[PDB]
Structure formats: C-alpha cells, structure tokens
Amino acid sequence: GSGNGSGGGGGGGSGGVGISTGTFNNQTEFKFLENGWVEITANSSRLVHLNMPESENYRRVVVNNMDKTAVNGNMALDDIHAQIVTPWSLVDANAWGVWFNPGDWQLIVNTMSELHLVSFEQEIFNVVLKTVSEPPTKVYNNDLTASLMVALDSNNTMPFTPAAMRSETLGFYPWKPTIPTPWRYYFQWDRTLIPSHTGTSGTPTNIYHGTDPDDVQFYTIENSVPVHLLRTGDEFATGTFFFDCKPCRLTHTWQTNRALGLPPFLNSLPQSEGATNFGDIGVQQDKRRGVTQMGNTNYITEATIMRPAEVGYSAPYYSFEASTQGPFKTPIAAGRGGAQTDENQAADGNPRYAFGRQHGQKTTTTGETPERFTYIAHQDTGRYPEGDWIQNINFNLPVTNDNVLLPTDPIGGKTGINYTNIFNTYGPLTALNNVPPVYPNGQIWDKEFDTDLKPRLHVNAPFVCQNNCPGQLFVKVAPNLTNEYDPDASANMSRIVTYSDFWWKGKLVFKAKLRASHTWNPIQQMSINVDNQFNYVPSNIGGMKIVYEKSQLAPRKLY
C-alpha cells in the first residue's frame, strides 16, 4: 500500500529526475527560396508506449499453413516461411502519413513539380518507466532507476525491414499515442510446392525441406550494435542523415505511343460545330507519305506509323514464379488506369493498401476489418490487354482468323487464358516512370538491393537510396528482475512487470520546386468540397480518418 518512496533528483546540464529533456514539435515548415525552390521541413513527434517483451529470448520459428495450400488450387495461399524473433522492437517511421497532414499534402501537390528528399534525423526523450503491482487494484509506480534500451543500427548490419509494408509504422496522429513493433526477420529455408487446380488428381508435392546450412545467418542486436541505456534523465539522439537519391516528380505523363510526334496533316476540316463533325486526313491510307517499321506494306496509319520508341511495356499476369523458397507474384511497374477501368477493371500493377485505425481507418469505427483502397496512378503508362493482338507477317488484310492471335483465343487449350497472360514486351526501347508516392500510406524511402545488377526502380517507394540508408532504430525494455533468479535454472525468468513511455521526435527534410503555368487551360488540382468535406474533420466524438490522395496531378509533355 506504499508510493515506493519518491526519489530525489540530482542535476546535470542535459538532464535529471524532474527535468524534461525534450521539446514537442510536430509542425511543418515551408521555406521559400530564390528561384522557386522550397525547403520543406517536417517535424513530427509522438508519444510512444512500449511493454516488456514476452520473453527475453531470440527464437527461431517456422510457420506452416500446409493445410490451407493442401487444398489444390490454393497455391497463392501459401504462407510458409522461417523467421527469427527478437525481443526487440522497431521504431519505424518511414511513411507519408507520419509526416504530413492533408493540408500539407495539398499544398505540395498542387504547387510543386518535383520533390527531393534531403535529410532526416530523430531523437528520443522524456523517458519514463513504471511498474505495475497488484482485490484487483492495479497500482503503478515509477521505477526511477530502471532503464530503457536503445540501439541504432547505423551500420545497417541488420536485414532491412521496412514496416510500412505491413502497416506498422507509427501512427499518423500527433495527438494520439502509438507504438513500435516487435522486431523479427526472415530466416532462411528451402521449400517446394507444385501448383495445381480444382480438377487436379492426388497430392502435388508440397513440402518444407529445411535449411541450407550455407544460406544461414543469425544476427543479434547485442552482438552488433551498441546499446544505450537511458534512465529518465537520459535522452538520446541520432545525428542527421543525408540522402543520396533521385528526385520524384509530381507530374504525370499522358501521351502513349499514339501521341508522339507530328500528327498527320488534315486536308479536310470541319465547317461547323458539333461532336460529329470530324476532320479528314484525306489521303488513301496506302498512299500517304511517311515512315514505318513495317517492310511489307504501304499502309500508314496512326497505328502503323513509326514511333521513336515505346512507352510502357507488357508483362505476364497474374504471374507466379518460384525459386528456392516458394512461389511469389511477379511484379509489374506500370499498373493500368484510365477510362476503361474505374477500380473495377482494377488489375495488375495497381497497388492496394490495407490498414488499421493507427493509419487511417476511422478511429471510431468498430470491428476489426481493415480499411482499404487501390491506388490508381494518373500516369497513363499501363496496358489494356484486351486491346492487344498479334498477326501474321504477311499482313494481308482485313485479316483471317488463321493469321491472328487474340486476347480471345485460348492458349494451351485453357479457356480463361490468352497470350496476353504470358506475354512480355519489355525491351531496349521501353521507357517509363517511377511509381508515384502514395499518401498517406506509402513508404517513403527504401534500401537498394545488394545485387550486382539492379532494378531500375522499386515499387514500394519512390525514393531508393543509392548508398546506405538510415539505420534502423530499436528499442526495448531492460529486464527488471525480482530477487529470485537462477540463470542456472531451466525455467523462464520472472521479471517485474515493467513498461515504458517516451517521446519521439523526428525531422525530415525535403526540397522541392514550385511549378509554373504553361498551358492556357488550367489544370487539375486537389481541393475540398461538399463531398469529401467530412473526411477532413473529426466527428462529434473525435472520430478521425485519413483518406488517401493522389500525387502526380499535373501533366507534362513526354515528348
């Protein structure tokens, strides 16, 4: 029935028991420079809460949903894999929402034309630790001398696990607390699994072989980073980090192979208004001057005519490939979009995000179903397979069935397939763009692969750091023991129930550039209205939510 004793505070220049060590700031600054450059500084802070780990051990676990895949035709459902599980927790902040609110986004997006990522740093403070002790009256006392541990993997020794890919970054609301996630990482494993269908006879091999001892790697924080111990008075801070990576644009393109170059001169123009009064080239298709890449005909049509190269490309879908560890969907860059979609035509390439209350779902809404959406980029660089086709070289037309392959004809005798599903047109002439950011649920920057050769882009984030990326930040509560402890014993050790709270504050800097009017007509711009109006404000209860928004609004020539 004691308060513990209240203990007394000694005082240095950067801290003590009853001395704050930090300052809260989650404010965003725009600073206009000469020539239309802007320096955007975004501050962000949060109160973070964290419990002691389940157990102070590292574990090696295997996951096995064999049963589900055992089904036949449920290949895609495979979740098998191995992983190391640590006692540490990770503080990840890589995600649009952590840093900006809508108002901000708006601005950026409407007035700028390109954006560069500059630097970033973070710090922790006002640390606090309390212990629970318990008729179920729970009491809480500060444990003045206990500690919080912190480690920053600046060397990037640990494997990299961006958490946004699972919606586990921090929260997006400055005024409400949040937490870090428990850290874990992939551990190697061999695995086989033969695809099958409903109609498939017997049991296609489906097994977990084990682990290529060659491929083994087991890391630990303890052995690789220096751990800091903070007490309340303590505080920690990373330096400032600078990024090396390309800029990101905020404009989208729209021309496709069809709109490149000099359109054909029309010998004949309409003479009155009306949406049926077309113009006419006025020349026999087989009599026109110009250039093609087709040696046989004399036809020259908007679809035949030569273009300098090729925007976009086509690839297989839905493709699953498989290697040593099981199958996985083959990614695309492009996505699709347009008039012939409307989220329902929604296909391959468009990404889809799913998430919780901490990241956008309405706070007050009950029921644990995740909120979702499919981002549909503005950039018209994807494909409409249905429109594709292939024909015989003789090119005698109108064309015969025997000389043409359609998205309609079935391949391999399977009805619901056609060449477009296994087609691929990437090649030296291909040209395209990087994905666009996705607010607020998009990852912001990402690490590059350590392969000898490399992707030309990643699909999860727009900024890929060329060199090293900022090291991960882990934390964890220091074990607080009871008076009984026998390491020699097999049992798990008992600890005092302990937990901690601390504030975290970060600063992320971008640099961008104002855009300027070039066309006569105005352009698209994000804006509020009666329809969405409520998405941007709390409910009479404090309901909040963050809807997704687009990014590359304005157009730009492609050529």
Partner DNA sequence: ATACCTCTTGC
The annotation places the binding site for Mg(2+) at: 155
**Counting contacts by CB under 7 A, is residue 222 touching DNA?**
no
Q: Residue 485, CB half-sphere, CA atoms under 13 Å: how many? A: 10
Contacts of 324 (CB under 8 A, 6+ apart): 190, 191, 212
Nearest partner of 4 among 135, 126, 147, 146, judged by Cα: 146
Pairing relationship of beta strands 59-63 and 148-152 according to DSSP bridges: unpaired
Q: Which one of 149-157, 194-202, 295-303, 472-480 is the stretch in contact with Mg ion (CB under 5 A)? A: 149-157
Binder to DNA among 251, 358, 434, 498 (CB under 7 A)? 251
397 makes contact with its own copies (CB under 8 A): no
Q: Does the protein bind its own copies through residue 326 (CB under 8 A)? A: yes
Kindly state the helix (H) or strand (E) to which residue 474 belongs, with its residue range.
strand 473-477
The pattern of x and - marking residues 138 through 177 that bind its own copies according to CB under 8 A reads: ----------------------xxxx-xx-x---------
- Identify the residue among 366, 519, 533, 540 touching DNA (CB under 7 A): 519
Asked if 113 and 514 touch (Cβ cutoff 8 Å), the reply is yes
- Residue 321 CA to residue 487 CA, distance in Å, equals 48
Minimum CB separation of residue 159 from DNA in Å reads 8
- C-alpha to C-alpha distance for 527 and 138, rounded to whole angstroms: 49
Listed ranges 26-34, 185-193, 353-361, 500-508: which one lies at the site for its own copies (CB under 8 A):
185-193
Q: Which does 239 bind (CB under 5 to 8 A by kind): Mg ion, DNA, its own copies, none?
A: DNA
Q: Nearest CA to 242 among 514, 512, 511, 440?
A: 511
What is the spatial distance between Cα 442 and Cα 75, in angstroms, rounded to a whole number?
Answer: 28
Query: Shortest gap between Cβ of 113 and DNA (angstroms)?
Result: 6
Contact 364, 542 (CB under 8 A): yes
Q: Which range touches DNA (CB under 7 A), out of 372-380, 510-518, 531-539, 543-551?
A: 510-518
Nearest approach in angstroms of CB 371 to DNA is 29
C-alpha 43/C-alpha 240 separation (Å) is: 13
Contact range with its own copies by CB under 8 A, out of 117-125, 318-326, 356-364, 500-508: 318-326
Cβ closest to its own copies, residue 184 vs residue 307: 184
| Pick 85 or 509: Cβ nearer its own copies | 85
Residue 323 touches Mg ion, criterion: CB under 5 A: no
Among 20, 277, 298, 324, binds its own copies (CB under 8 A): 324
Distant-in-sequence, close-in-space partners of 1: CB < 8 Å, separation ≥ 6: none
How far are the Cα atoms of 55, 77, 184, 205, 542 from residue 189, in angstroms, in the given order? 24, 18, 15, 17, 46
Residues preceding discontinuities in the chain at C–N > 2.5 Å?
A: 134
Distance CA 137, CA 387 (A): 69
Nearest-approach distance from CB 215 to Mg ion, in angstroms: 4
DSSP letter assigned to residue 109: H
Q: Footprint of its own copies on residues 432-451 (CB under 8 A)?
A: 450-451
Residues 9-68 that bind Mg ion (CB under 5 A): none
Binding residues (CB under 8 A) for its own copies: these are: 61, 63, 79, 81, 83, 85, 160-163, 165-166, 168, 181-182, 184-186, 188, 212, 214-215, 246, 249, 252-266, 321, 323-326, 328, 450-452
Binding residues (CB under 7 A) for DNA: these are: 28-32, 35-36, 113, 119-122, 152-157, 217, 235-244, 251, 450, 467-468, 470-471, 473, 514-516, 518-519, 554-557
